[PDB]
Design a protein around this nucleic acid. Structure first.
Ligand code: ADP
Ligand code: BEF
Lengths: 97, 878
DNA sequence: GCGCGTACGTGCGTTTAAGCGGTGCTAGAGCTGTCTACGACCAATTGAGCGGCCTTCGGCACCGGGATTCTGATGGGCGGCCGCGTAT
DNA sequence: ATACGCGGCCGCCCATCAGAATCCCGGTGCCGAGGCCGCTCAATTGGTCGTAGACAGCTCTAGCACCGCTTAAACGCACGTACGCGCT
């Protein structure tokens, strides 16, 4: 496999693409919601899927984010996603001010 | 693969201030180092300038770091008490105890002859060590293997030789052999004698064994249930000749018991388990097969019995599914409770013939399991006030067969008595606050209001129940009852006080404390157990905890430490499912219950671990029933729940080719009939059929031998008769001595006597069988077997030549002297003629680098060597 | 950070075409007015559609039997052992 | 006292019988169209009434076009400064 410099960097990427499993765990996420959902109302219940569905939404939501972030990052002469790279992306999409 | 550091064992001083620096350890400390990829046994006292940069530097440095500070906390500080000195030293003591047991070997896995750099080949054994799993078994040569553990090697040979594999089992598939009621205890129970309720149990299992039906063992919690299966396994093996690899699945908690329970009640069948991970996975397969891979299902077969944890079933469902099994054992088979289980249809795929569950699971709680058990043992086979008689007419008549119900009324006559007392504890101060406020969101939302939301139902019917007696199970409880703002007395007092149960327990505990009873605490919740972990240490009572979070090795150490004759700790705390998991406690008398275990019967076994056949101190049980709470009601439902509790044709030429070689190798082979058949050498035929063929084969051998001798004998007389006639002429001068004919009788006679030609015959199979070769070795070995037997019996090797002189072998490559011959003979006496690697490798012989099978002597040289010695000392060359 | 390069901002003069209010013209939106076709509604009969329930052959990947090739003890015959041994 | 005989040992080429391994034929499990089907409640069928909306007439806004006086805005070019972007 050639040498070692930036060897995995592109490798993991590819394997992750071929797959289609959830990027983030499905146990911490499950409480995260239960916990905030309480603050806006009491005595809450949850459909098995409802979360499954959120996970799907969210994950997908972030990737998408990163996907631009990357571009921005490239624009900059950089291969590094940065704390702001996040902001511009959002700002111009418009949720971020 | 390199010589690098693996671990730390021992630390000591190297040489004759306030804190030792690393230099001090380097110039004043010697440390025992275990090397990488190498057993424990080769450990070296080495420093840093001694070895230099070696791969692996990390563990010593830290361990030295641990060492430096350790030195400051035993001798170099006055805040240290009496007790820390006890622990800081103690560690040294235990750290070595877990290191010592690796030196003792526990099983030899296989034997490989591998070559060395001096051109030599030496035998090595794959050695397995004590209380460790199949990994890191490294090869060690045989020289010292028997020099430290002779017993292992003796047994190592025995299994390989004891041809009793699943290769010869009787065809009773179609139909069975009529079976017999046993009176006596089978000559296969070395562990002892059982009683009058362990042999009959066995006679039913084996009794419906011959029906083609499977059965349920439903006896009390510990009526030698395990002995009944092991003996059941033993008598189905030397009764109906079943070598059929029996599969047994037991709990990860209860197997170590079983092994010893299997290796002490029945020596002769070996018991190889399944308890590893990745590496093991391979070693199991190393011995699980013969000759690497195998066409079809032609595995030669190297086990019968196994033990499997419930994990491992499901992780590798597939490989067992393929291999056939016809007998099943399982431990505490209440698992198959629902008919939607994963192991519930996992077990059904394993081609099987008979099953065997053995648990005391009550079978009226739900009718599901009652049916599930019946559906599982027998796939296919399956109220009203006035039809109930009609109903149990159907249920009693059908259910019984595959069922066993039998009371203690046995072995309990010796064992000291059983007893249980309830406890009515009423509520406290801070208690009502959280018995009252919690059933609303008044002050439950003021303090910890964010969490209120999720626990709100938890707290109602599956907490209040659990958080009724003790409110200390959340956050805003600890300072609630402590009325002040470090105090040590108050914390102890403040915690004992809040609960009705804590005080009641503290006083009873004290009450028996001075009288002398060992007390048990079974709590439902993990944390309660830390809670107490925190209090009892403080007030100085020696204990250990028994949770759901502990390595098999660590679990095992303490359980034994506890049942030993002189153990200080009379306090031991356990779990409901984790506590009653398995095991037994035989020293313990008292057991106390904090809260009922949301159900009837989880407690009944929970006391079963302590109340067993052994206990000689009666028994004592306390149940802390909360008053004016929610504990009460379940207790009543619990009651509702437990209301009901109910000839091979002839021998062909190839065998005749098989038998002839075996005689040259072993001599009379009539005694050894089965051992050869078990392994490749012989087909399965009745004992006589071979024995008669063995005898006529020599009978054919001698007749040809004599007939030939007679004929030459008759001619030889005729030639000498002529020979004398010439002799008269020779001294008379008619023919002169220095001018006598080319051909004349003297020459004819000479060639005739010096006749050299093998003697031959047929035997309805072989071509031109050697008549003399067979007769000569049969007798010579008979003689050597006879003399050493009657003078050197107890120890073979002492065998001596004494004066008698057999030829010197000057020019052979290696040292050859009379002692070497002494062993050479014993070697065949032990292994047979013609197998010489066997003889050369043997640790006992000591001939290992004097044999070379340009280097002499090789295989024929020895072959030449024995025939000459054996004839020589009987006087054969006469 | 720094340094090189150059392109893009700022200016003036030249130049080009928008914006303004002026008129004229008629097209196409918006209104208006009568008819009647096509969609809603109510009826009664009929099978497409949904839950409930279990089917069969073909394809991936593990498999099966028979002739054939390579390794091991066997064996008479020509040679060599130089060292104990009987006969004169 | 002195010389001849030989004896198993051994390298040699030369012979026999079993075991290993490749090719000739294979069974097995998984996936995806199929079939069966049946109680039935939504679409279809035959049918009446009435009303939107097509359609023809009409008039009456506003979108187009067109022109010329006036001029602000665009244009193009000249000059240099202060950034884009390249390197380290
Ligand atoms: N039938 C028996 N005969 C002799 N000894 C027994 C018998 N049953 C049990 N024992 C002894 O009692 C101990 C535990 O046996 P048992 O009570 O059946 O196991 P468990 O804890 O599973 O019930 C063992 O150490 C064994 O020596
Ligand atoms: F019968 Be037991 F608890 F192994």
């Amino acid at each position: 496999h050639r040498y070692r410099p930036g060897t995995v960097a592109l490798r993991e990427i590819r394997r992750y693409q071929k797959s289609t499993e959830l990027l983030i765990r499905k146990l911490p996420f499950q409480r995260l919601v239960r916990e905030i959902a309480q603050d806006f109302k009491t005595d809450l219940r949850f459909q098995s899927s409802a979360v499954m569905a959120l996970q799907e939404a969210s994950e997908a939501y972030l990737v998408g984010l990163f996907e631009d972030t990357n571009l921005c990052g490239i624009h900059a002469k950089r291969v590094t996603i940065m704390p702001k790279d996040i902001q511009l992306a959002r700002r111009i999409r418009g949720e971020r001010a | 693969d390199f010589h690098g550091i693996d671990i730390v064992i021992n630390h000591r001083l190297k040489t004759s201030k306030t804190v030792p620096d690393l230099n001090n350890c380097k110039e004043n400390y010697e440390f025992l180092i275990k090397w990488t990829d190498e057993s424990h046994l080769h450990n070296t006292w080495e420093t840093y300038e001694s070895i230099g940069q070696v791969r692996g530097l990390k563990r010593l440095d830290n361990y030295c770091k641990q060492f430096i500070i350790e030195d400051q906390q035993v001798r170099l500080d006055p805040y240290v008490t009496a007790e820390d000195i006890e622990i800081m030293d103690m560690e040294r003591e235990r750290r070595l105890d877990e290191f010592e047991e690796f030196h003792v070997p526990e099983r030899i896995i296989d034997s490989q002859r591998a070559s060395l750099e001096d051109g030599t080949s030496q035998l090595q054994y794959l050695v397995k060590w004590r209380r460790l799993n199949y990994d890191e078994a490294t090869w060690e040569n045989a020289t010292d293997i028997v020099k430290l553990a002779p017993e292992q090697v003796k047994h190592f040979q025995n299994r390989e030789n004891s041809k009793i594999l699943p290769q010869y089992s009787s065809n009773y598939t179609s139909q069975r052999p009529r079976f017999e009621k046993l009176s006596v205890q089978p000559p296969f129970i070395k562990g002892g004698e059982l009683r009058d309720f362990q042999l009959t149990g066995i006679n039913w299992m084996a009794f419906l064994w011959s029906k083609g039906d499977n059965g349920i063992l439903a006896d009390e919690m510990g009526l030698g249930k395990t002995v009944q299966t092991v003996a059941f396994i033993s008598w189905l093996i030397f009764a109906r000749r079943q070598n059929g690899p029996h599969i047994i699945v037991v709990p990860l908690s209860t197997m170590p018991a079983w092994l010893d329970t299997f290796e002490k009640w029945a020596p002769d069948l070996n018991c190889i388990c399944y308890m590893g991970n990745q590496k093991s996975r391979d070693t199991i397969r190393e011995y699980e097969f013969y000759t690497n891979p195998r066409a079809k299902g032609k595995k030669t077969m190297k086990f019968n019995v196994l033990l499997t944890t419930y994990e491992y079933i499901l992780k590798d469902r597939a490989e067992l599914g393929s291999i056939k099994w016809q007998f099943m054992a399982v431990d505490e088979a209440h698992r198959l409770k629902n008919a939607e289980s994963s192991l519930y249809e996992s077990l059904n795929s394993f081609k099987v013939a008979n099953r065997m569950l053995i648990t005391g699971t009550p079978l009226q709680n739900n009718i599901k399991e009652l049916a599930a058990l019946v559906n599982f043992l027998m796939p296919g086979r399956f109220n009203q006030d006035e039809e109930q008689e009609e109903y149990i007419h159907d249920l009693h008549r059908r259910i019984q067969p595959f069922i066993l119900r039998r009371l203690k009324k046995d072995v309990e006559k010796s064992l000291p008595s059983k007893t249980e007392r309830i406890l009515r504890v009423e509520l406290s101060d801070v208690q009502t606050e959280y018995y009252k406020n919690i059933l609303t969101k008044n002050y439950s939302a003021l303090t910890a209001g964010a969490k209120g939301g999720h626990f709100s139902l938890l707290n109602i019917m599956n907490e209040l129940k659990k958080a009724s007696n003790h409110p200390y199970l959340f956050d805003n409880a600890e300072e609630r009852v402590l009325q002040k703002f470090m105090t040590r007395e108050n914390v102890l007092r403040g915690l004992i006080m809040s609960s009705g149960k804590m005080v009641l327990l503290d006083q009873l505990l004290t009450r028996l404390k001075k009288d002398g009873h060992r007390v048990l605490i079974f709590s439902q919740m993990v944390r309660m157990l830390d809670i107490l972990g925190d209090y009892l240490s403080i007030k100085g009572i020696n204990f250990q905890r028994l949770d759901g979070t502990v390595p098999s090795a660590q679990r095992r150490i303490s359980i034994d430490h506890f049942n030993s004759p002189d153990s200080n700790d009379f306090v031991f705390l356990l779990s409901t499912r984790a506590g009653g998991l398995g095991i037994n406690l035989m020293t313990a008398d008292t057991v106390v219950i904090f809260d009922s275990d949301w159900n009837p019967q989880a407690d009944l076994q929970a006391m079963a671990r302590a109340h067993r056949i052994g206990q000689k101190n009666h028994v004592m049980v306390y149940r802390l029933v909360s008053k004016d709470t929610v504990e009460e009601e379940v207790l009543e439902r619990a009651r509702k729940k437990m209301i009901l509790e109910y000839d091979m044709d002839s021998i062909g030429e190839s065998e005749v080719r098989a038998l002839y070689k075996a005689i040259l190798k072993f001599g009379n082979l009539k005694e050894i009939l089965d051992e050869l058949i078990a392994d490749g050498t012989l087909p399965v035929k009745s004992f006589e059929k071979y024995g008669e063929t063995y005898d006529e084969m020599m009978e054919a051998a001698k007749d040809c031998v004599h007939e030939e001798e007679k004929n030459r004998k008759e001619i030889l007389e005729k030639l000498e008769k002529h020979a004398t006639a010439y002799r008269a002429k020779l001294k008379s001068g008619e023919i002169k001595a220095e001018n006598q004919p080319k051909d004349n009788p003297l020459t004819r006679l000479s060639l005739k006597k010096r006749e050299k030609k093998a003697v031959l015959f047929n035997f309805k199979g072989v071509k031109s069988l050697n008549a003399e070769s067979l007769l000569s070795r049969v007798e010579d070995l008979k003689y050597l077997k006879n003399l050493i037997n009657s003078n050197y019996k107890d120890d073979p090797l002492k065998f001596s030549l004494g004066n008698n002189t057999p030829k010197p072998v000057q020019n052979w490559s290696s040292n050859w002297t009379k002692e070497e011959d002494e062993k050479l003979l014993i070697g065949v006496f032990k292994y047979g003629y013609g197998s010489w690697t066997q003889i050369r490798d043997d640790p006992f012989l000591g001939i290992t680098d004097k044999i070379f099978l340009k280097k002499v002597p090789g295989a024929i040289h020895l072959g030449r060597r024995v025939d000459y010695l054996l004839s020589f000392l009987r006087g054969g060359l006469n």
